[model samples]
Target chain A: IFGYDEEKVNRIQGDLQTVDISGVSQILKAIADENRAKITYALCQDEELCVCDIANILGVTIANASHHLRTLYKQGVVNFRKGKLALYSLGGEAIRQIMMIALAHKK
Target chain B: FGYDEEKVNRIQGDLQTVDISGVSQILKAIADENRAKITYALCQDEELCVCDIANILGVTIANASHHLRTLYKQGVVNFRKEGKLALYSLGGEAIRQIMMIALAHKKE
Candidate 1:
Protein backbone atom coordinates (compact mmCIF):
# COMPACT_ATOMS: atom_id res chain seq x y z
CA ILE A 1 0.00 0.00 0.00
CA PHE A 2 1.27 3.46 -0.87
CA GLY A 3 -0.86 4.97 1.90
CA TYR A 4 -4.03 6.45 0.42
CA ASP A 5 -7.35 4.65 0.97
CA GLU A 6 -9.55 3.07 -1.72
CA GLU A 7 -12.13 5.85 -1.53
CA LYS A 8 -9.48 8.47 -2.25
CA VAL A 9 -8.25 6.54 -5.25
CA ASN A 10 -11.74 6.08 -6.62
CA ARG A 11 -12.60 9.71 -6.22
CA ILE A 12 -9.40 10.83 -7.88
CA GLN A 13 -9.85 8.33 -10.68
CA GLY A 14 -13.34 9.58 -11.38
CA ASP A 15 -12.08 13.13 -11.45
CA LEU A 16 -9.49 12.19 -14.02
CA GLN A 17 -11.99 10.63 -16.42
CA THR A 18 -12.54 13.76 -18.48
CA VAL A 19 -8.96 14.91 -18.59
CA ASP A 20 -7.73 14.96 -22.21
CA ILE A 21 -4.32 13.31 -22.43
CA SER A 22 -3.79 13.21 -26.20
CA GLY A 23 -4.97 16.75 -26.50
CA VAL A 24 -2.43 17.84 -23.92
CA SER A 25 0.32 16.05 -25.80
CA GLN A 26 -0.74 17.54 -29.10
CA ILE A 27 -0.63 21.14 -27.94
CA LEU A 28 2.63 20.67 -26.04
CA LYS A 29 4.24 18.96 -28.99
CA ALA A 30 2.95 21.60 -31.35
CA ILE A 31 4.60 24.41 -29.43
CA ALA A 32 7.60 22.49 -28.16
CA ASP A 33 10.15 23.82 -30.64
CA GLU A 34 12.23 26.86 -29.70
CA ASN A 35 11.94 28.23 -33.24
CA ARG A 36 8.18 27.81 -33.10
CA ALA A 37 8.04 29.76 -29.87
CA LYS A 38 9.99 32.51 -31.54
CA ILE A 39 7.56 32.44 -34.44
CA THR A 40 4.69 32.61 -32.01
CA TYR A 41 6.10 35.64 -30.26
CA ALA A 42 6.80 37.40 -33.52
CA LEU A 43 3.37 36.64 -34.93
CA CYS A 44 1.83 38.01 -31.74
CA GLN A 45 3.76 41.24 -32.04
CA ASP A 46 3.02 41.81 -35.71
CA GLU A 47 -0.46 40.22 -35.79
CA GLU A 48 0.35 39.02 -39.35
CA LEU A 49 3.38 38.31 -41.53
CA CYS A 50 4.59 36.30 -44.48
CA VAL A 51 7.27 33.60 -44.76
CA CYS A 52 9.92 36.10 -45.80
CA ASP A 53 9.31 38.28 -42.76
CA ILE A 54 9.29 35.30 -40.42
CA ALA A 55 12.58 33.97 -41.82
CA ASN A 56 14.31 37.33 -41.70
CA ILE A 57 12.95 38.14 -38.27
CA LEU A 58 14.11 34.90 -36.68
CA GLY A 59 17.30 34.45 -38.71
CA VAL A 60 16.13 31.18 -40.16
CA THR A 61 15.91 30.14 -43.81
CA ILE A 62 12.65 30.50 -45.70
CA ALA A 63 12.28 26.73 -45.71
CA ASN A 64 12.77 26.52 -41.95
CA ALA A 65 10.38 29.37 -41.21
CA SER A 66 7.77 27.94 -43.54
CA HIS A 67 8.10 24.55 -41.94
CA HIS A 68 7.59 25.91 -38.41
CA LEU A 69 4.74 28.21 -39.45
CA ARG A 70 3.02 25.37 -41.26
CA THR A 71 3.15 23.29 -38.09
CA LEU A 72 1.74 26.17 -36.09
CA TYR A 73 -0.87 26.71 -38.75
CA LYS A 74 -1.83 23.07 -38.79
CA GLN A 75 -2.12 23.13 -35.01
CA GLY A 76 -4.47 26.15 -35.37
CA VAL A 77 -2.03 28.39 -33.55
CA VAL A 78 -1.73 30.45 -36.70
CA ASN A 79 -3.59 31.30 -39.91
CA PHE A 80 -2.35 32.45 -43.31
CA ARG A 81 -3.29 34.04 -46.60
CA LYS A 82 -2.28 32.53 -49.91
CA GLY A 83 -2.10 34.81 -52.95
CA LYS A 84 1.12 35.85 -54.67
CA LEU A 85 2.61 35.55 -51.19
CA ALA A 86 1.39 33.80 -48.06
CA LEU A 87 0.86 36.00 -45.00
CA TYR A 88 0.61 34.05 -41.78
CA SER A 89 -0.89 35.34 -38.58
CA LEU A 90 -1.75 33.96 -35.16
CA GLY A 91 -5.13 32.35 -34.80
CA GLY A 92 -7.40 31.02 -32.03
CA GLU A 93 -7.58 31.84 -28.35
CA ALA A 94 -5.11 29.22 -27.20
CA ILE A 95 -2.21 30.99 -28.88
CA ARG A 96 -3.11 34.25 -27.18
CA GLN A 97 -3.53 32.52 -23.85
CA ILE A 98 -0.09 30.94 -24.15
CA MET A 99 1.60 34.25 -24.76
CA MET A 100 -0.46 35.92 -22.08
CA ILE A 101 0.68 33.31 -19.60
CA ALA A 102 4.27 33.51 -20.78
CA LEU A 103 4.58 37.29 -20.76
CA ALA A 104 3.00 37.39 -17.32
CA HIS A 105 5.13 34.64 -15.80
CA LYS A 106 8.42 35.00 -17.67
CA LYS A 107 11.36 35.77 -15.41
CA PHE B 1 16.53 39.96 -50.56
CA GLY B 2 14.51 37.07 -49.13
CA TYR B 3 12.51 39.41 -46.86
CA ASP B 4 11.93 42.94 -45.73
CA GLU B 5 15.15 44.60 -44.62
CA GLU B 6 14.04 47.19 -42.03
CA LYS B 7 11.28 45.04 -40.43
CA VAL B 8 13.73 42.16 -40.23
CA ASN B 9 16.29 44.12 -38.27
CA ARG B 10 13.63 45.46 -35.90
CA ILE B 11 12.15 42.05 -35.06
CA GLN B 12 15.52 40.33 -34.76
CA GLY B 13 16.56 43.05 -32.32
CA ASP B 14 13.29 42.65 -30.41
CA LEU B 15 13.71 38.90 -30.12
CA GLN B 16 17.01 39.47 -28.41
CA THR B 17 15.36 41.54 -25.68
CA VAL B 18 12.84 39.12 -24.15
CA ASP B 19 14.12 36.33 -21.92
CA ILE B 20 11.44 33.63 -21.68
CA SER B 21 13.68 30.88 -20.31
CA GLY B 22 11.67 30.24 -17.15
CA VAL B 23 8.38 29.93 -19.00
CA SER B 24 10.06 28.06 -21.83
CA GLN B 25 11.69 25.61 -19.41
CA ILE B 26 8.41 24.85 -17.72
CA LEU B 27 6.64 24.21 -21.03
CA LYS B 28 9.49 22.06 -22.35
CA ALA B 29 9.51 20.04 -19.14
CA ILE B 30 5.80 19.31 -19.45
CA ALA B 31 6.24 18.36 -23.09
CA ASP B 32 7.37 14.97 -21.86
CA GLU B 33 4.40 12.59 -22.08
CA ASN B 34 4.50 11.24 -18.54
CA ARG B 35 4.94 14.59 -16.91
CA ALA B 36 2.16 16.10 -19.03
CA LYS B 37 -0.19 13.26 -18.11
CA ILE B 38 0.82 13.46 -14.47
CA THR B 39 0.21 17.18 -14.59
CA TYR B 40 -3.26 16.64 -16.06
CA ALA B 41 -4.03 14.09 -13.34
CA LEU B 42 -3.03 16.39 -10.51
CA CYS B 43 -4.96 19.27 -11.99
CA GLN B 44 -8.12 17.27 -12.74
CA ASP B 45 -8.21 15.53 -9.39
CA GLU B 46 -7.57 18.70 -7.41
CA GLU B 47 -5.05 16.84 -5.28
CA LEU B 48 -3.39 13.43 -5.11
CA CYS B 49 -1.01 11.36 -3.00
CA VAL B 50 1.91 9.36 -4.40
CA CYS B 51 -0.07 6.15 -4.15
CA ASP B 52 -3.00 7.58 -6.05
CA ILE B 53 -0.59 8.86 -8.63
CA ALA B 54 1.06 5.45 -8.95
CA ASN B 55 -2.14 3.47 -9.26
CA ILE B 56 -3.89 5.94 -11.52
CA LEU B 57 -0.87 6.21 -13.76
CA GLY B 58 -0.25 2.42 -13.70
CA VAL B 59 3.26 2.85 -12.46
CA THR B 60 5.10 2.05 -9.28
CA ILE B 61 5.05 4.47 -6.36
CA ALA B 62 8.79 5.02 -6.74
CA ASN B 63 8.32 5.99 -10.37
CA ALA B 64 5.42 8.25 -9.59
CA SER B 65 7.36 9.81 -6.77
CA HIS B 66 10.28 10.44 -9.07
CA HIS B 67 8.13 12.34 -11.55
CA LEU B 68 6.43 14.29 -8.79
CA ARG B 69 9.76 15.25 -7.29
CA THR B 70 10.98 16.43 -10.67
CA LEU B 71 7.99 18.70 -11.23
CA TYR B 72 7.95 19.79 -7.60
CA LYS B 73 11.52 21.02 -7.85
CA GLN B 74 10.72 22.64 -11.17
CA GLY B 75 7.97 24.63 -9.42
CA VAL B 76 5.39 23.08 -11.71
CA VAL B 77 3.49 21.52 -8.81
CA ASN B 78 3.10 21.76 -5.01
CA PHE B 79 2.19 19.46 -2.13
CA ARG B 80 1.12 19.24 1.49
CA LYS B 81 0.69 16.47 4.03
CA GLU B 82 -2.16 15.18 6.10
CA GLY B 83 -0.95 12.62 8.61
CA LYS B 84 0.89 9.95 6.56
CA LEU B 85 -0.36 11.12 3.18
CA ALA B 86 0.92 14.02 1.18
CA LEU B 87 -1.50 15.47 -1.35
CA TYR B 88 -0.14 17.16 -4.44
CA SER B 89 -1.96 19.94 -6.24
CA LEU B 90 -1.09 21.74 -9.43
CA GLY B 91 0.93 24.82 -8.73
CA GLY B 92 -0.01 28.45 -9.48
CA GLU B 93 -1.90 30.00 -12.39
CA ALA B 94 0.82 29.10 -14.83
CA ILE B 95 0.12 25.37 -14.77
CA ARG B 96 -3.63 25.76 -14.90
CA GLN B 97 -3.24 28.20 -17.75
CA ILE B 98 -1.17 25.71 -19.69
CA MET B 99 -3.73 22.97 -19.15
CA MET B 100 -6.59 25.26 -19.91
CA ILE B 101 -4.98 26.33 -23.13
CA ALA B 102 -4.25 22.73 -24.02
CA LEU B 103 -7.74 21.41 -23.31
CA ALA B 104 -9.36 24.20 -25.24
CA HIS B 105 -7.32 23.57 -28.34
CA LYS B 106 -6.97 19.80 -28.06
CA LYS B 107 -10.70 19.25 -28.19
CA GLU B 108 -11.11 21.48 -31.19
Candidate 2:
Protein backbone atom coordinates (compact mmCIF):
# COMPACT_ATOMS: atom_id res chain seq x y z
CA ILE A 1 0.00 0.00 0.00
CA PHE A 2 1.65 3.25 -1.15
CA GLY A 3 -0.58 5.26 1.15
CA TYR A 4 -0.48 2.92 4.12
CA ASP A 5 -1.00 3.51 7.83
CA GLU A 6 -4.38 1.82 7.78
CA GLU A 7 -5.52 3.02 11.17
CA LYS A 8 -4.77 6.66 10.43
CA VAL A 9 -5.87 6.47 6.81
CA ASN A 10 -9.09 4.68 7.71
CA ARG A 11 -9.83 7.22 10.40
CA ILE A 12 -9.28 9.98 7.85
CA GLN A 13 -11.53 8.18 5.37
CA GLY A 14 -14.23 7.93 8.01
CA ASP A 15 -13.88 11.45 9.43
CA LEU A 16 -13.64 12.99 6.00
CA GLN A 17 -16.91 11.31 4.97
CA THR A 18 -18.94 13.63 7.16
CA VAL A 19 -17.12 16.42 5.32
CA ASP A 20 -18.70 15.88 1.86
CA ILE A 21 -15.43 16.01 -0.06
CA SER A 22 -17.28 16.35 -3.38
CA GLY A 23 -18.74 19.62 -2.17
CA VAL A 24 -15.27 20.96 -1.58
CA SER A 25 -14.24 19.94 -5.07
CA GLN A 26 -17.34 21.58 -6.51
CA ILE A 27 -16.58 24.81 -4.65
CA LEU A 28 -13.09 24.79 -6.04
CA LYS A 29 -14.48 24.24 -9.52
CA ALA A 30 -16.85 27.16 -8.98
CA ILE A 31 -14.14 29.80 -8.72
CA ALA A 32 -11.45 28.14 -10.79
CA ASP A 33 -12.55 29.97 -13.93
CA GLU A 34 -11.12 33.45 -14.64
CA ASN A 35 -14.46 35.22 -15.06
CA ARG A 36 -15.78 33.45 -12.02
CA ALA A 37 -12.70 34.42 -10.00
CA LYS A 38 -13.10 38.09 -10.93
CA ILE A 39 -16.79 37.98 -10.14
CA THR A 40 -15.79 36.47 -6.83
CA TYR A 41 -13.20 39.19 -6.19
CA ALA A 42 -15.64 41.91 -7.11
CA LEU A 43 -18.28 40.49 -4.82
CA CYS A 44 -15.66 40.54 -2.11
CA GLN A 45 -14.66 44.15 -2.82
CA ASP A 46 -18.18 45.51 -3.03
CA GLU A 47 -20.48 44.43 -0.21
CA GLU A 48 -23.43 44.03 -2.54
CA LEU A 49 -23.76 44.56 -6.26
CA CYS A 50 -26.60 43.82 -8.68
CA VAL A 51 -26.24 41.85 -11.91
CA CYS A 52 -26.52 44.74 -14.36
CA ASP A 53 -23.99 46.65 -12.34
CA ILE A 54 -21.59 43.74 -12.19
CA ALA A 55 -21.91 43.34 -15.93
CA ASN A 56 -21.19 47.05 -16.37
CA ILE A 57 -18.27 46.92 -13.97
CA LEU A 58 -16.70 43.87 -15.56
CA GLY A 59 -17.44 45.03 -19.13
CA VAL A 60 -19.44 41.93 -19.96
CA THR A 61 -23.01 41.52 -21.12
CA ILE A 62 -25.73 41.43 -18.47
CA ALA A 63 -26.39 37.86 -19.57
CA ASN A 64 -22.78 36.89 -19.08
CA ALA A 65 -22.53 38.64 -15.75
CA SER A 66 -25.79 37.06 -14.61
CA HIS A 67 -24.43 33.64 -15.51
CA HIS A 68 -21.38 34.24 -13.37
CA LEU A 69 -23.42 35.63 -10.51
CA ARG A 70 -25.83 32.73 -10.66
CA THR A 71 -23.01 30.25 -10.17
CA LEU A 72 -21.45 32.23 -7.33
CA TYR A 73 -24.83 32.81 -5.72
CA LYS A 74 -25.90 29.18 -5.70
CA GLN A 75 -22.54 27.90 -4.48
CA GLY A 76 -22.76 29.76 -1.16
CA VAL A 77 -19.78 31.78 -2.34
CA VAL A 78 -22.37 34.55 -2.37
CA ASN A 79 -25.84 35.23 -0.99
CA PHE A 80 -28.58 37.29 -2.57
CA ARG A 81 -31.70 39.13 -1.51
CA LYS A 82 -34.48 40.37 -3.76
CA GLY A 83 -34.25 44.10 -3.53
CA LYS A 84 -36.17 46.33 -5.93
CA LEU A 85 -33.77 44.30 -8.04
CA ALA A 86 -31.75 41.29 -6.90
CA LEU A 87 -28.85 42.20 -4.59
CA TYR A 88 -25.86 39.87 -4.27
CA SER A 89 -23.34 39.70 -1.44
CA LEU A 90 -20.82 37.30 0.03
CA GLY A 91 -21.97 34.70 2.54
CA GLY A 92 -19.08 34.99 4.96
CA GLU A 93 -15.75 36.65 5.59
CA ALA A 94 -14.07 33.26 5.42
CA ILE A 95 -14.43 33.19 1.62
CA ARG A 96 -12.80 36.61 1.36
CA GLN A 97 -10.00 35.49 3.64
CA ILE A 98 -9.54 32.36 1.59
CA MET A 99 -9.37 34.38 -1.62
CA MET A 100 -6.89 36.74 0.00
CA ILE A 101 -4.73 33.79 0.91
CA ALA A 102 -5.17 32.29 -2.57
CA LEU A 103 -4.21 35.56 -4.26
CA ALA A 104 -1.15 35.99 -2.08
CA HIS A 105 0.07 32.68 -3.48
CA LYS A 106 -0.60 33.78 -7.07
CA LYS A 107 2.87 35.20 -7.31
CA PHE B 1 -21.50 49.10 -21.69
CA GLY B 2 -22.41 46.21 -19.40
CA TYR B 3 -19.31 46.23 -17.15
CA ASP B 4 -18.57 49.90 -17.82
CA GLU B 5 -17.45 52.08 -14.93
CA GLU B 6 -13.78 53.15 -14.82
CA LYS B 7 -12.57 51.88 -11.43
CA VAL B 8 -14.42 48.57 -11.71
CA ASN B 9 -13.22 48.35 -15.29
CA ARG B 10 -9.66 48.44 -14.08
CA ILE B 11 -10.33 45.72 -11.52
CA GLN B 12 -11.80 43.40 -14.12
CA GLY B 13 -8.99 44.22 -16.52
CA ASP B 14 -6.63 43.06 -13.79
CA LEU B 15 -8.32 39.67 -13.90
CA GLN B 16 -6.60 38.84 -17.17
CA THR B 17 -3.32 38.90 -15.29
CA VAL B 18 -4.89 37.02 -12.40
CA ASP B 19 -5.53 33.77 -14.27
CA ILE B 20 -1.92 33.62 -15.53
CA SER B 21 -1.05 33.62 -11.84
CA GLY B 22 -0.98 30.43 -9.71
CA VAL B 23 -3.91 30.39 -7.28
CA SER B 24 -6.35 29.15 -9.86
CA GLN B 25 -3.89 26.54 -10.97
CA ILE B 26 -3.33 25.33 -7.44
CA LEU B 27 -7.03 25.45 -6.71
CA LYS B 28 -7.74 23.37 -9.80
CA ALA B 29 -4.91 21.07 -8.86
CA ILE B 30 -6.40 20.38 -5.46
CA ALA B 31 -9.85 19.80 -6.90
CA ASP B 32 -8.89 16.60 -8.60
CA GLU B 33 -10.90 14.11 -6.52
CA ASN B 34 -8.18 11.56 -5.89
CA ARG B 35 -5.60 14.24 -5.29
CA ALA B 36 -7.77 15.97 -2.69
CA LYS B 37 -8.38 12.70 -0.90
CA ILE B 38 -4.69 11.83 -0.86
CA THR B 39 -3.94 15.41 0.17
CA TYR B 40 -6.27 15.44 3.16
CA ALA B 41 -4.99 12.01 3.97
CA LEU B 42 -1.53 13.54 4.02
CA CYS B 43 -2.83 16.50 5.98
CA GLN B 44 -3.85 14.12 8.74
CA ASP B 45 -1.03 11.62 8.58
CA GLU B 46 1.81 14.00 7.68
CA GLU B 47 3.75 11.73 5.25
CA LEU B 48 3.93 8.58 3.17
CA CYS B 49 6.23 6.91 0.66
CA VAL B 50 5.94 5.86 -3.01
CA CYS B 51 4.79 2.29 -2.56
CA ASP B 52 2.73 3.11 0.49
CA ILE B 53 1.05 6.00 -1.26
CA ALA B 54 0.53 3.88 -4.35
CA ASN B 55 -1.28 1.18 -2.44
CA ILE B 56 -3.12 3.67 -0.31
CA LEU B 57 -4.46 5.37 -3.39
CA GLY B 58 -5.11 1.97 -4.97
CA VAL B 59 -4.02 3.30 -8.32
CA THR B 60 -1.24 2.09 -10.50
CA ILE B 61 2.24 3.05 -9.41
CA ALA B 62 2.36 5.25 -12.50
CA ASN B 63 -0.93 7.06 -11.75
CA ALA B 64 -0.15 7.40 -8.08
CA SER B 65 3.31 8.78 -8.78
CA HIS B 66 1.80 11.12 -11.35
CA HIS B 67 -0.57 12.60 -8.78
CA LEU B 68 2.18 13.02 -6.21
CA ARG B 69 4.59 14.66 -8.64
CA THR B 70 1.86 16.96 -9.97
CA LEU B 71 1.18 18.39 -6.48
CA TYR B 72 4.86 18.52 -5.71
CA LYS B 73 5.37 20.79 -8.70
CA GLN B 74 2.36 22.87 -7.68
CA GLY B 75 4.01 23.31 -4.24
CA VAL B 76 1.10 21.62 -2.47
CA VAL B 77 3.40 18.87 -1.25
CA ASN B 78 7.04 18.28 -0.29
CA PHE B 79 9.28 15.27 -0.12
CA ARG B 80 12.47 13.98 1.44
CA LYS B 81 14.62 10.90 1.06
CA GLU B 82 14.47 8.12 3.59
CA GLY B 83 17.03 5.45 2.81
CA LYS B 84 16.13 4.24 -0.69
CA LEU B 85 12.60 5.63 -0.63
CA ALA B 86 11.06 9.08 -0.88
CA LEU B 87 8.84 10.22 1.98
CA TYR B 88 6.13 12.59 0.75
CA SER B 89 4.37 15.18 2.90
CA LEU B 90 2.21 18.25 2.64
CA GLY B 91 4.13 21.43 1.79
CA GLY B 92 1.72 24.30 1.26
CA GLU B 93 -0.21 24.87 4.47
CA ALA B 94 -2.65 27.16 2.63
CA ILE B 95 -4.09 24.12 0.89
CA ARG B 96 -4.36 22.21 4.14
CA GLN B 97 -6.26 25.13 5.59
CA ILE B 98 -8.36 25.58 2.46
CA MET B 99 -9.29 21.92 2.37
CA MET B 100 -10.42 22.06 5.99
CA ILE B 101 -12.45 25.16 5.21
CA ALA B 102 -13.96 23.48 2.18
CA LEU B 103 -14.78 20.42 4.23
CA ALA B 104 -16.69 22.54 6.72
CA HIS B 105 -18.86 23.66 3.81
CA LYS B 106 -20.67 20.32 3.72
CA LYS B 107 -23.25 21.70 6.07
CA GLU B 108 -23.77 24.94 4.22
TM-score: which candidate is best?
Answer: 1
How do the residues B26-82 of candidate 2 rate in per-residue lDDT, one tens digit apiece? 777888887887777787777877666666666787888899888888887889998
lDDT of 1 by residue, A1-107 (tens): 65556776667567667767666766667676788877777776787788878887777788998888878877787888786988888777678788668657654
- Top lDDT hit: 1
- Model 2, global lDDT: 0.74
Model 2 ranges off by over 4 Å: A1-4, B1-4, B13-20
lDDT of 2 at A101: 72
Distance from true location, Cα of B101 in model 2, Å: 1.3
Q: Write the per-residue lDDT of candidate 2 for residues A40-76, one digit (tens) a residue.
A: 7777677887887678766678899888878876778
Looking at candidate 1, what TM-score does chain B attain? 0.81
Docking class of 2: medium
Model 1 lDDT at residue A37: 77
